[PDB]
Design a protein around this ligand. Sequence first.
Ligand SMILES: Cc1cc2nc3c(=O)[nH]c(=O)nc-3n(C[C@H](O)[C@H](O)[C@H](O)COP(=O)(O)OP(=O)(O)OC[C@H]3O[C@@H](n4cnc5c(N)ncnc54)[C@H](O)[C@@H]3O)c2cc1C
Ligand SMILES: Cc1cc2nc3c(=O)[nH]c(=O)nc-3n(C[C@H](O)[C@H](O)[C@H](O)COP(=O)(O)OP(=O)(O)OC[C@H]3O[C@@H](n4cnc5c(N)ncnc54)[C@H](O)[C@@H]3O)c2cc1C
Ligand SMILES: Cc1cc2nc3c(=O)[nH]c(=O)nc-3n(C[C@H](O)[C@H](O)[C@H](O)COP(=O)(O)OP(=O)(O)OC[C@H]3O[C@@H](n4cnc5c(N)ncnc54)[C@H](O)[C@@H]3O)c2cc1C
Ligand SMILES: Cc1cc2nc3c(=O)[nH]c(=O)nc-3n(C[C@H](O)[C@H](O)[C@H](O)COP(=O)(O)OP(=O)(O)OC[C@H]3O[C@@H](n4cnc5c(N)ncnc54)[C@H](O)[C@@H]3O)c2cc1C
Ligand SMILES: O=C(O)c1cncc(O)c1
Ligand SMILES: O=C(O)c1cncc(O)c1
Ligand SMILES: O=C(O)c1cncc(O)c1
Ligand SMILES: O=C(O)c1cncc(O)c1
Ligand code: NA
Ligand code: NA
Ligand code: NA
Ligand code: NA
Ligand code: NA
Ligand code: NA
Ligand code: NA
Ligand code: NA
Lengths: 369, 369, 369, 369
Amino acid sequence: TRRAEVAGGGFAGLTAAIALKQNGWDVRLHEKSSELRAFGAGIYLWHNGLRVLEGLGALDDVLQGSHTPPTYETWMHNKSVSKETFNGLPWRIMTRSHLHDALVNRARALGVDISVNSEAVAADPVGRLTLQTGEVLEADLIVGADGVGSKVRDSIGFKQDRWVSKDGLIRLIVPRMKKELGHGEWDNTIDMWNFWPRVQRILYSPCNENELYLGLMAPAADPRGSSVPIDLEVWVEMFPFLEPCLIEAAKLKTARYDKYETTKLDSWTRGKVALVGDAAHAMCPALAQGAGCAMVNAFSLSQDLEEGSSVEDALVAWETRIRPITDRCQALSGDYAANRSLSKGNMFTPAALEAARYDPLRRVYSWPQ
Amino acid sequence: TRRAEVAGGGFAGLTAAIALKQNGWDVRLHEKSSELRAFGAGIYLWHNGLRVLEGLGALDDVLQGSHTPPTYETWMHNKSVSKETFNGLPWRIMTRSHLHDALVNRARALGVDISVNSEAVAADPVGRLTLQTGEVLEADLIVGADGVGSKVRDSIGFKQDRWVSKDGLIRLIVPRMKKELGHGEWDNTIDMWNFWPRVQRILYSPCNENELYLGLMAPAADPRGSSVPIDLEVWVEMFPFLEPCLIEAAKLKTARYDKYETTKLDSWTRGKVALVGDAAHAMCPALAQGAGCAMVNAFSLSQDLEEGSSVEDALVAWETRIRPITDRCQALSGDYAANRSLSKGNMFTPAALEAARYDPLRRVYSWPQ
Amino acid sequence: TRRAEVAGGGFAGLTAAIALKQNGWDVRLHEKSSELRAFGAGIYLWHNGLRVLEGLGALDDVLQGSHTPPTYETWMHNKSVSKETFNGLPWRIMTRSHLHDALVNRARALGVDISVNSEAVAADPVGRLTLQTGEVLEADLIVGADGVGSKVRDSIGFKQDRWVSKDGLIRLIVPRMKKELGHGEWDNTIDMWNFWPRVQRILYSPCNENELYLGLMAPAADPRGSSVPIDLEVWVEMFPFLEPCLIEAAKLKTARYDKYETTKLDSWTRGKVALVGDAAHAMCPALAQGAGCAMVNAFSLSQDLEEGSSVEDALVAWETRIRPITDRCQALSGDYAANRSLSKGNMFTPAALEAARYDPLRRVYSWPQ
Amino acid sequence: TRRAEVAGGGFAGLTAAIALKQNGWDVRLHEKSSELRAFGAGIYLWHNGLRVLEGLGALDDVLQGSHTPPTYETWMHNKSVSKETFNGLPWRIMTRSHLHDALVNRARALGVDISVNSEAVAADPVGRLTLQTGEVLEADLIVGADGVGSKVRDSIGFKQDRWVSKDGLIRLIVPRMKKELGHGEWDNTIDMWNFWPRVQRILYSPCNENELYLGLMAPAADPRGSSVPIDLEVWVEMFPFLEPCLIEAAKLKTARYDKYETTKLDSWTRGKVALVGDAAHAMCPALAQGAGCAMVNAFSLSQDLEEGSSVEDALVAWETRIRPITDRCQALSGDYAANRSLSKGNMFTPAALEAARYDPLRRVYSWPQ
Ligand SMILES: Cc1cc2nc3c(=O)[nH]c(=O)nc-3n(C[C@H](O)[C@H](O)[C@H](O)COP(=O)(O)OP(=O)(O)OC[C@H]3O[C@@H](n4cnc5c(N)ncnc54)[C@H](O)[C@@H]3O)c2cc1C
Ligand SMILES: Cc1cc2nc3c(=O)[nH]c(=O)nc-3n(C[C@H](O)[C@H](O)[C@H](O)COP(=O)(O)OP(=O)(O)OC[C@H]3O[C@@H](n4cnc5c(N)ncnc54)[C@H](O)[C@@H]3O)c2cc1C
Ligand SMILES: Cc1cc2nc3c(=O)[nH]c(=O)nc-3n(C[C@H](O)[C@H](O)[C@H](O)COP(=O)(O)OP(=O)(O)OC[C@H]3O[C@@H](n4cnc5c(N)ncnc54)[C@H](O)[C@@H]3O)c2cc1C
Ligand SMILES: Cc1cc2nc3c(=O)[nH]c(=O)nc-3n(C[C@H](O)[C@H](O)[C@H](O)COP(=O)(O)OP(=O)(O)OC[C@H]3O[C@@H](n4cnc5c(N)ncnc54)[C@H](O)[C@@H]3O)c2cc1C
Ligand SMILES: O=C(O)c1cncc(O)c1
Ligand SMILES: O=C(O)c1cncc(O)c1
Ligand SMILES: O=C(O)c1cncc(O)c1
Ligand SMILES: O=C(O)c1cncc(O)c1
Ligand code: NA
Ligand code: NA
Ligand code: NA
Ligand code: NA
Ligand code: NA
Ligand code: NA
Ligand code: NA
Ligand code: NA
């Protein structure tokens, strides 16, 4: 039996572990943290990620208790500038914990061996993974799914450009308060942009009938807008229609102003080691596809390992096949972020939706625009 | 090699033929008409039917050149009473020819032997199909996909209740005239109900950027509203906002006032003969699921024939497994039609969407409400 | 000093009494009822009536505590069909008591001698008024302002057509409940028409920040819709958006289903007797001008009595000058009522607004359309 | 017969001349310009100014061919922030020429002696007016209605503060293009504010079915926004919904970027000389009351001259009676302009509307808020 050692229990690592286990690999997954958890409050998935979930046998648990808004709406200075439904392209909003739980439960159901407090500190291309405990594990495949600060990557040495932004946002889950919001379209995604009187934006993202995912975005140089716990007054001033939800947001002492971070590498493979997710390709969140691409790439890795080739050759074939979708999406999302393109509305163009349109199960693009 | 003879080249027969051919059956399909064509102007499919298309390898050709509205909207007396998006449940509108062409092209690509001017006039449960030419074909499976007036069914004799309504509607494809319609949400499905000043209704159904599917519904006792070609004045009077499209509709000399028709049988099988689609279960169109159920049932038949059982036993197992979804949907659609339930809006309830939610590929219900 | 005896303490009689007293007449007014009061809940005035109030020195007290809606809106089956603002033509809504009080207070301020429990039972063209007490009062002018059942008129004998309708309405004052009505344009006049599922209409008429005037109109043959106190269920069913106000309306045990009533006479004068208001020209309320015309005619009477002619000649001149405006408005309002013309919206045409446009102070038409 | 000499043929001078002529004064009016004309494209009047017009016998000609919008609407960054109708307070929009013509025609009808190319260069408090021709005219009253640069004022010497702003606006009349504007509320006043992406504002003011009054406001430091003829691109960019009207505006080679200008004086009188209008009290246009106050003050002057006092005493009484309304309105309009208060919407408060609410005919405040 082929053995895989996966470093990291995020969406990339769990996807890799499930996909490999379904194909008969002996899979062990190692999470550095003391518990299995997902940070970031909420998350969007699209057709591509939902198809991965179908491929993993985890779609049912995800769709139950998650939300597809009637439309993706954009506001500029409180004026609705677009409503987009992507010509039926499937999409979904959920809490991070909801997605995480579904993947963990599926991995456990399949008998994936999951270890917590288990940090990969070094990886060897010949197929050896060293944990912080000093345990050296031999494997036929090593998956570096260990995030932007991947030690699987950096122990080997990959030529790279990394960037941590000065700016960021505050992501929270609060109650919907739907009745208290009164008249409106409060099941929508609403991306609420402003440049005047200050640069403040809220991405309003319903997760289900109970939970609302809010992203509060202000520059780091704004001492009030970037404050945690949230400066209620400055958010209510520019988003008064969300006051009921913002009052609940202001109670959260766990709120963090998290910075954006990107990674791009010359390659994603070395011998029997494959880098997946933020370890390889962390990107700007404009197109809401960092985890989508991570999951597609992890699932696609399992596919290329079923061709009867050596692991080394399968990994090379995998990157060649799948990386361009991620490269283009990363580049375009970065362009969108820098140009504030989403502020215009109607920017989920055919090109913007390329990654979302990809079906990893059939390996074709679907849901034409 | 197992041989199947399929009577009828509608959506049920083509689905059966493709699904069987994909599983290695030697399939021949017989269409009574001189050409392969689909009547009825336009058609809605939902998740269940779209999943059948995925199973048939015909989804790509269908999604290209078809439309998912941003919302399914209902009007009563020109007042919007509901907007429904079904919590992300996939759905699609297309011309009948668009769906038909996709299925025919797929059947031809797989090497299904299609005959036109080939009418099944008698079927024997032992596996003999007699054509109007006098040709007697022996087969391991006979599929009666030959519509509400099925001769495969009636030559054998199935206890049945059939009903042809006095009332009906006029279904047409016209240009979108989107610019000429001016301000509005003209990519929506809009079910435009009226009881005052007369009983007149238009189901407004965009198929793509070029083609609009209209259903003009008035009682048979209304000599103007039921007239073909359409009485332009009486339609413009109550739907003045559609005048540009109605002017184009009035040019169509091919317009027909078609009656609603239902069939229900005590059983769908006899020996090696299976009845699929309108031959077995024609229903009211309120839930837009007659072809959806027909396609699910045809696809499901192919599945039950892969269990290693006798054809006779597989057919019995098939009906037992799949019929209840169709029975409930038929009953509920008839209830909706009789009570004019759709006129209230917000009537695509979890129960109404049961058939749509069924995934025939995984044999589970998806897209929870 | 010239002496006038006025029969009736309604809007016509009070207007006549004030206007005459301002011109130096010794005026006595006789009200049959035990108290000075105005029935009918609320009332609309337009430019013509507001100009009379200006002429009477009673405009200030009327405008304080009354309401001009931002627009006059019409709904058919809950769909807004028109919004009308009459090109700036002044108009106003108020409670009947508000208008009544303003006129009574002005009459008292001028020293008009007002008697209650004082019914005119006979009038003589030579200038004698007999009260129910048997008191015979001699005067230079007798004003029959004693309503649709005028005894001043009928004691003399005027050729006439009177009509009392079988149908009618329930008029009430309730609290605004503005906050409880939620999203909307609840300061508007909204004429809420329906023919389906039943013939039920509400004229929604805000009087000020505290008081709402509702007219609930259903046919007499409808036992539920015409019931008093109101059948809450049947009104909430068709006007659910007014439920907070309708709950308050249902508490009113004083509610009446009052019938429409009209009067038309061959003449309005006989010797020293002049008939004013409903005594002469009761009309359908479609154009909201019965009191408007009554007040214009009463004020105009005082004007014609300042020409230095005999009272008999002044009265003849008065009717000749002013009656055609009332005749046309009565006729058009009756046409509108019979044809349900207001149900279409946009029916306050230049012709419909003729009476409203008349300025009695300058004797010209203003506020062109 | 009392003789009045009026310097200036603007709204103040024409009002003074008509009002005095109606009271039996021998009135001569002197306009410096070669023709009688009014600059500034369009103008708003309110109840106070409309009542002056009624007092002048010029209301009929003004209301015919002018417009009361259904509402006064305010936008910030294309989002509607308020709709105001002032609780029925009368108001009106018209072209400057429309108002001017009505006043000139009334003055001519009354036999006011109007001279063009007749400039007042000096005034003496004893009642002598010297024209640029050298003609010295003796009079019982001299009216300085000669604008912000009044030579009647400055020849005498009045302690004053004058201010000419660096900023200004471009005022134009263009066709309505109502059909070309498509869906909207295009009969409204719409004050269209923006601070982002640049400081640009359009006051949209329909005058009648044919003519639209536009005020295009940008800072003088903006070389494109302040350009004449208008820089079409920069106006269409921020007001694309007005493109049809802006294309017509760009054709006007007569367009001017006119600066705001204010005047405030310690007194308005000296002996037999009275200063009226912009000569005395030019103000910021935020409350749209510069001409309103000018007309009220000119009309009020005629009233105080009917008390049987000396002209000198009547003038002192006039200023004491009427100036505080103008002082408060000037101050508040300046505050509004400086604070950009109108950008918030809902700022026509009872205090803001004080001047508008004043009725000069009855000398009371009407139309309570
Ligand atoms: C503001 C924001 C919004 C976003 N929104 C979206 C969205 O809507 N949709 C979407 O698809 N994506 C979104 N993304 C992207 C998404 O968050 C990431 O791309 C995705 O979570 C990365 O998954 P991962 O498994 O690669 O890495 P991670 O989620 O970082 O998981 C790595 C795991 O490995 C563990 N670990 C780290 N080092 C080691 C080690 N040495 N050994 C063992 N374990 C280790 C960590 O503790 C962690 O649990 C967003 C990102 C940001 C910043
Ligand atoms: C007004 C209306 C609207 C509808 N809207 C929808 C909708 O939106 N969505 C949806 O899913 N469904 C809809 N339906 C239902 C749908 O039209 C039918 O259920 C579906 O087309 C039936 O397919 P079928 O293949 O069973 O039969 P058919 O479409 O009738 O095809 C039978 C074929 O067999 C041929 N034939 C007949 N007899 C013989 C014979 N003896 N031998 C050989 N060939 C023969 C015929 O010529 C025909 O081509 C609607 C129905 C109506 C009436
Ligand atoms: C449903 C409805 C809605 C209406 N809405 C409007 C509206 O919005 N605007 C509008 O302008 N008009 C409206 N009208 C018309 C308006 O109500 C009448 O035209 C107006 O009140 C008539 O005034 P009046 O003074 O002529 O008669 P009344 O109001 O009838 O007053 C007559 C008075 O004389 C007294 N009286 C009677 N007989 C004698 C006697 N013999 N001696 C002494 N006193 C006597 C009575 O007690 C009464 O107080 C409406 C009418 C109806 C039915
Ligand atoms: C941008 C803007 C918008 C405005 N909008 C409004 C509004 O909506 N509503 C409103 O009410 N007001 C408005 N105003 C104010 C209004 O324009 C003025 O207050 C009003 O026109 C002043 O009238 P006037 O007669 O005092 O002076 P002017 O209109 O300046 O008239 C003076 C006349 O006297 C002549 N003249 C000058 N010197 C002499 C002399 N020595 N001898 C003889 N004749 C002379 C001039 O040629 C001129 O014809 C606005 C002002 C501005 C700047
Ligand atoms: O920062 C964004 O533009 C962004 C856009 N979409 C989803 C998300 O989480 C973030
Ligand atoms: O007749 C209907 O109610 C109907 C409802 N949905 C689709 C359709 O084709 C018909
Ligand atoms: O019955 C009417 O149509 C009517 C219309 N306007 C005011 C009113 O009181 C009644
Ligand atoms: O500049 C203004 O704020 C202004 C406001 N109202 C009318 C007008 O002409 C100008
Ligand atoms: Na991507
Ligand atoms: Na991306
Ligand atoms: Na069905
Ligand atoms: Na059905
Ligand atoms: Na009338
Ligand atoms: Na009338
Ligand atoms: Na003023
Ligand atoms: Na002012």
